[PDB]
Write a protein that binds this DNA or RNA. Structure first.
Ligand SMILES: Nc1nc2c(ncn2[C@@H]2O[C@H](COP(=O)(O)OP(=O)(O)OP(=O)(O)O)[C@@H](O)[C@H]2O)c(=O)[nH]1
Ligand SMILES: Nc1nc2c(ncn2[C@@H]2O[C@H](COP(=O)(O)OP(=O)(O)OP(=O)(O)O)[C@@H](O)[C@H]2O)c(=O)[nH]1
Ligand SMILES: [Mg+2]
Ligand SMILES: [Mg+2]
Lengths: 171, 171
DNA sequence: CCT
């Protein structure tokens, strides 16, 4: 296995294109109440599936819920694309304010893996250009994550490595 | 600053071309007895500064000293180039054997910075082709370090980032 | 400088 160490109080930020397997991974490794996804926060704002007209409100709600869980000292996982620096920065600042380590888990998979998974999804699908763009953004982001303020940066480079991951939580 | 977290029980493996500043960095951040350098181990095998033939024995000696220190529960830093996967593999095995975390600290500096520091050092220089080779080997190594078994991988991407490092040791 |  590939062991990824995280502090008992962490903010775990998943970073990956649509189709990279972020939500699948979060379900496998974390309790449901530890995981706050952008899709869930959109669903609070709208009774339409994956409503694109409420994006800003949904991310405001995600930041708020994340902050209040960290205030209570509860480990939290942010399940969103997080491929833009502008997306990650508030999460780093929130972790700081609550004396929490921010941890990056990056799904560094080839674009084709994500494009192929996308076409077979039974929940929702995105257009090909979205995944092309996310993948470019993700790859561009890797080098500067430590400098951005992530205390541990874990990069997963294939489905096989993702599959092998085990988390070790430290008190 | 850039905070690098390491457990009190760590094997810290410095990875970098000749000239990248490994020994200077080790001296700034760790106690002298914590640092085992390949240069010191060659010196135990020969007073001939340029006796090429002692390299294999010197690394056997280095590995054994590291083993015994980790067995004693003493944090140890390996001060050698560590740019070949074959050099890192036995160090990872040692850390595992004594239930210690192997940590990678990578001096990802441009070849030119290393070449210039080599030209200007007054202690012991290497030939230009050596630094060209080391830098190529170092860059090729970065992606695979986590999969080799390093539990924390810290990449320093400029002299500015190297100077900003502070270690936080956690027990 | 793991030649
Ligand atoms: N074979 C295999 N398929 C996977 C794996 N992980 C995810 N998938 C499939 O890939 C598709 C996308 O997975 P998700 O976890 O929803 O991807 P995501 O990164 O959350 O995507 P977004 O929510 O759009 O950002 C789903 O149909 C998954 O079942 C995996 O580890 N192995
Ligand atoms: N300006 C500046 N010079 C440095 C720094 N670190 C090292 N140097 C200089 O670079 C030269 C080599 O530094 P070392 O620490 O000996 O490099 P090394 O990586 O141990 O080299 P090898 O033992 O040959 O593998 C010395 O002359 C240092 O004074 C630094 O952080 N800033
Ligand atoms: Mg998802
Ligand atoms: Mg040195």
């Amino acid at each position: 296995s590939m062991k990824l160490t995280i502090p008992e109080l962490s903010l775990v930020v998943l970073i990956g294109s649509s189709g990279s397997g972020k939500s699948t991974f979060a379900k496998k490794h974390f309790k449901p109440t530890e995981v706050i996804s952008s899709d869930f926060c959109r669903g609070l704002m709208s009774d339409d599936e994956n409503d694109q007209t409420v994006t800003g409100a949904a991310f405001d709600v995600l930041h708020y819920i994340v902050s209040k869980r960290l205030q209570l000292g509860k480990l939290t996982v942010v399940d969103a694309t997080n491929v833009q620096e502008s997306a990650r920065k508030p999460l780093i600042e929130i972790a700081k304010d609550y004396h929490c380590f921010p941890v990056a888990v990056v799904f560094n998979l080839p674009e084709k893996v994500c494009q192929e998974r996308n076409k077979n999804r039974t929940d929702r699908q995105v257009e090909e250009y979205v995944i092309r763009k996310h993948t470019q953004q993700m790859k561009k982001s890797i080098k500067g994550l430590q400098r951005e303020g992530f205390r541990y940066v874990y990069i997963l480079n294939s489905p096989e490595e993702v599959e092998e991951v085990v988390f070790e939580r430290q008190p």
